[PDB]
């Protein structure tokens, strides 16, 4: 598998145009595995096509100060509301794999997602983060002991929460990785660890109950990843989840469902504060940074565009599309006359009820 | 007539690609008379694009069980809550004809629908059935003796159900067979033995009443297909039907017409159980099936899918796209949170007003 | 100016391919002053989308006999419940001109529109006629012995009823008229007889009150042609009027207006029964004669496609268009389960609040 | 920089095609700095596209008189109810830059927006304006020295207005200019005069405060720029502003916002005739002033279209723009029934919640 190795910074005048860009330096097959999404992907389309549906108004400013994009989450000052999505096989796009995007990230200074299924062992992800802080991305296994495991690798990978992933019992129906009979070129060093001796895809199992398993014993906060239905992220909540991330994994699961940003409101009304939200699936601008908050989310979390700009430039490419989020929102703070993220969650948009082609 | 004659399984990713597939193998003008649907195909379109109004959450499990798609109608125990459509003359697709459909279906182990106007004598398609089920579909003829016949017929084939067709008192507007000019390349064994020294098209006339002779005289349940309107659906119920197939025949029929799917649930409403509903017209994918049962009906028929199958492999073609169906519904079903298909009939259906573009 | 001038029928499969059809043996010009529309022609395609906006439902019969067309109008009996609209310079389509129109009209055995703007002299459309029913349109002159002048033309003429065109005081933005600098390559004869020696477009001026004066001294019932707005109607009315033809003139007047079937049931509701109401601009199927009836038209006026069946076939290829209609009409009848025109009236249509791309 | 040289009037047919025509002669750089937008345009497809959700209706007369555009606004008499809209650097498409745009809008008649960004001195300027009114837009300074400096500047011009423009504290992401590496490539003599010894993009800073310290120190109305939320109105009215500018920049500033003449109907709801509205952003055709005017504007403002047309033909192309205009509002006046621009004012818009494919 001959993943680009080079890297550099790059010019970032939009995320959309980075797609094509790393389909010229990445492997067909890998390349099709990153960008795919389930059945036709009119799911991807309408995770893209549901930001039109809330539009930003301009609005004057009501305060003097310079704008500051820095938030904090789970008691971790970031530098703008954005954190990197948990990403399998980081190695498809460069050699450098999580190492590059742990050191974009926290040179960046925000919080890395590590997926369980990661192609980098803990040590390699390590150096890249320098210090920097670090939630963990498990499933559920079927045999507990494999749930102890991967709790005690986290903590002991000074992971400060976990994300549990429940939307993803069993794969999407991605017809690009069908069509290319796409096979993983690399292991998941992590999950060998524990499962080495006791197929990996098939271990998997989420219920409520699951989800107050590991809340109790995971001694670290927990995320529910792949909520869209607002009564899951109340069951979830009153099961012991710290967090509600609410996703649908970029698209690369349940075909013919709403566009991510579609469900926030109604599971952001139900959340009612009790505990914080990240939110993902389809984040390309700025514009929509603000946008997610602005309908209750805490932070988002990104994933496609960083793992196109690994590509492109290592960990000075991925770095670049964290820069370039923190400028475009810088901009659309300075034209909705918000000097700070708090102000973007107060945002009043505009209803368009006609959609994409207005 | 050149039919494809290849009998072999067939990998599908998906149905629409199905289509082209078999444009390749199939001849031109049966191809067409397949594919094809009344004036500009709107009606069709709509078909297919009625399923992103109403689209599928992902949810969390209430049950520890693997699904299972088994269900039952009328009795019989079928192994997915899906059935063969009545369609003429499978011929046009396949030498083995209407046994290769019977043989595909049986083995899967749902039921299998005659067209009255079936390509192939009952002997023939019974040794595709080897004994499983068959509903029978039969058009209202004016000459009352020839509905007493078909009747009598129906019942010599141990067909457990008649399907009364009401949506075809003549033909719709089908483009593509009027430019083609395109004509019947073998006949009618079924119809013609009893037509016979008594103009097919034309024997055929339906109203309540009609209904009531035909409930009154079969001595077996009879399903009124083509039902788009609920108060239509309680006029037949009232009249006899003991079942109500939703259906715009694929779109061959009435130009200008809603997609079938946007019809269901009004219906389903008016129903409101007195009878099984089987709904068709636009089934591509599982997450169809799955929005069918959630907006009311029992099962869902199949139509063209299967017959592209059978061009393309014979009954082992046919039989991949029941399974395909069968595979996808259970991916639909772990990642809706659903054990079994009364889960499905219980699902939450986000409201698209956006419709197709988003 | 090189007209067509074959005489034959034309096997009409659908009557939107008679446009590009024409539009090989219609000079360019002339072509695209029959077909062209205001601005960028968006309210034209506003007129054709707008039939997907209500639904036909297929639905049972209440009745055994089979379905007749035939409808009456101002105490006209007439084949089917579509009259022909008031066209300009048929010769511009072909050399037989109005008078092969006005053939085929009567000979299908409906109503005659004569526009004032005519191309054929009376006694040319008069043997044409041969006795049928006429119907003649006039614009209000600013000169009124010039509406004197008309009003006995149209008398003398034997006109059953006066169409005033309300909505023509000055040209529509035909973009492809002004790019092709197109002009009239014949004369108005009708005009003329009364204009010469008393700018013909410019001696046009309507108010409540020129209808009043219309109606007060035609001796004939006077409909307004051109109403796309209740109060309108209503004030025209009570004006005088004796009928309400809604129409916006095929678009070719005022642009980014509604598509013409948007605007009837409101015009409908405040006519309330008082007079009856002709509907136009965009009728092309069978399909569209029926929801136009149903959402409380009397009859529909047929444009275009007419004059593309006489550039085809002369009066016997207007008269396939007119048979088409008809023929496509019953059909409509059949799968809707109506008898007659009256149960065309009373159709329940499914509002599609998607639109055209669904 | 070759900027076309040449004086003629134009036959303007539309003015959507002066768009491609301007991109034959202008350099590509500057022509797409006139012509972008933000981000993938798709604020400014929304800006045209939002015409087609009100529609017009054509309607009776209820006066004899032949129509007159003429207004009022701010005690001058202008010849139709539209203005030029304050653009920066109309050298770009011209080598007469703003002389000729004063020329052409003296001579039609209107008032000229001067911006702050001029290319061509005063002087120059003055000399096309020929004794024509003039307002003068600025931006807010953060050094209150260079605000009292074009104060006084506005003043010794003969302004009757300033326009403070508030959506411009930074510049839109307008990927146009960045992938062409565009740089102006002549200098802004206005604010040089005022700048030199004392960056010009950063100089600039807006709140209430800002409004009313401009409102209370210039000595004429202000007029607040970019405008598209009711409260920003509300309060710029009680911070002393005597106009409302609703305009977003003809899209060149803050990304997936609403078309801007969705937002106008809640503004004029909220201003409720307290100050004049001017609306911008999107106006191509007759039928947009109209419908700006039957939404609560007073006058519209024109941008792109004007420089187009300086750049076919200098002074004489940019008045053929205007005459264009003229023209086209005449026509739509006479078909809506309307007298004069009060008229205008009074119309009942057909509302299309379809939006632009119908
Ligand atoms: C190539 C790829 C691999 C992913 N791997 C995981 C994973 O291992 N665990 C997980 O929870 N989500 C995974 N996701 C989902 C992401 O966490 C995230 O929800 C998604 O990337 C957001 O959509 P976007 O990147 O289109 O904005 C993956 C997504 C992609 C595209
Ligand atoms: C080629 C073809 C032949 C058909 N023949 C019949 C028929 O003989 N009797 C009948 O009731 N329906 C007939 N149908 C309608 C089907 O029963 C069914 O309603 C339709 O295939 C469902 O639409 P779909 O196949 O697009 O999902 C036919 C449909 C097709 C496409
Ligand atoms: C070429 C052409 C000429 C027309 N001339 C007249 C006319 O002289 N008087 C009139 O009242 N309407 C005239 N109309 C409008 C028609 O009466 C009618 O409203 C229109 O054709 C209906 O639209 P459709 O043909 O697209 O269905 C004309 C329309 C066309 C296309
Ligand atoms: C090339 C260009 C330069 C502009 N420069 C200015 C400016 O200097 N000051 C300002 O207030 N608006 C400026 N605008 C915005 C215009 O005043 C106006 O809002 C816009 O042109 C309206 O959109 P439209 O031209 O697409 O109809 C500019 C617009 C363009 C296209």
Chains 1, 2, 3, 4 share one sequence.
């Not at 040179?107 to 299924?117: K, L, Q, R, V, W």
């Not at 986290?154 to 069993?170: H, M, N, P, R």
């Not at 590509?311 to 490419?317: D, H």
């Amino acid at each position: 598998y001959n993943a680009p190795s080079e890297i550099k910074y790059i010019d970032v005048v939009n995320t959309y145009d980075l797609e094509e860009e790393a389909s010229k330096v990445v492997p067909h097959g890998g390349f099709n595995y990153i960008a795919g999404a389930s059945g036709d992907e009119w799911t991807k389309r309408a995770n893209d096509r549901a930001w039109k549906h809330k539009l930003l108004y301009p609005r004057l400013a009501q305060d003097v100060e310079a704008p500051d994009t820095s938030t904090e989450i789970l008691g971790h000052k970031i530098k703008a509301p954005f954190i990197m999505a948990p990403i399998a096989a980081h190695g498809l796009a460069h050699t450098t794999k999580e190492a590059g995007t742990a050191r974009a990230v926290s040179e960046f200074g925000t919080i890395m997602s590590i997926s369980a299924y990661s192609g980098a062992t803990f040590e390699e992800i390590s150096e890249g983060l320098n210090g920097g802080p670090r939630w963990f991305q498990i499933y559920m296994a079927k045999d507990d002991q494999q749930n102890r495991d991967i709790l005690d690798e986290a903590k002991s990978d000074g992971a400060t929460a976990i994300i549990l992933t429940a939307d993803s019992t069993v794969s999407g129906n991605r017809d690009r990785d069908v069509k290319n009979k796409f096979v993983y070129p690399f292991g998941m060093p992590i999950v060998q660890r524990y499962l080495r001796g006791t197929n990996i895809y098939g271990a998997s199992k989420i219920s409520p109950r699951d989800i107050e398993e590991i809340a109790a014993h995971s001694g670290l906060p927990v995320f529910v990843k792949g909520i869209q239905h607002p009564e899951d992220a109340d069951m979830a909540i009153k099961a012991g989840a710290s967090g509600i991330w609410v996703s649908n994994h970029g698209a690369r699961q349940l075909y013919e469902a709403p566009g991510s940003f579609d469900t926030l409101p109604a599971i952001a009304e139900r959340v009612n504060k009790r505990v914080p939200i990240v939110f993902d699936s389809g984040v390309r601008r700025g514009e929509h940074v603000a946008k997610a908050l602005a309908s209750g989310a805490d932070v988002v979390a990104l994933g496609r565009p960083v793992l196109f700009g690994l590509a492109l430039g290592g960990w000075q490419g991925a770095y670049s599309v964290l820069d370039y989020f923190q400028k475009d929102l810088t901009r659309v703070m300075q034209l909705t006359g918000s000097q700070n993220v708090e102000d973007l969650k107060g945002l009043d948009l505009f209803d368009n009820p006609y959609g994409y082609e207005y």
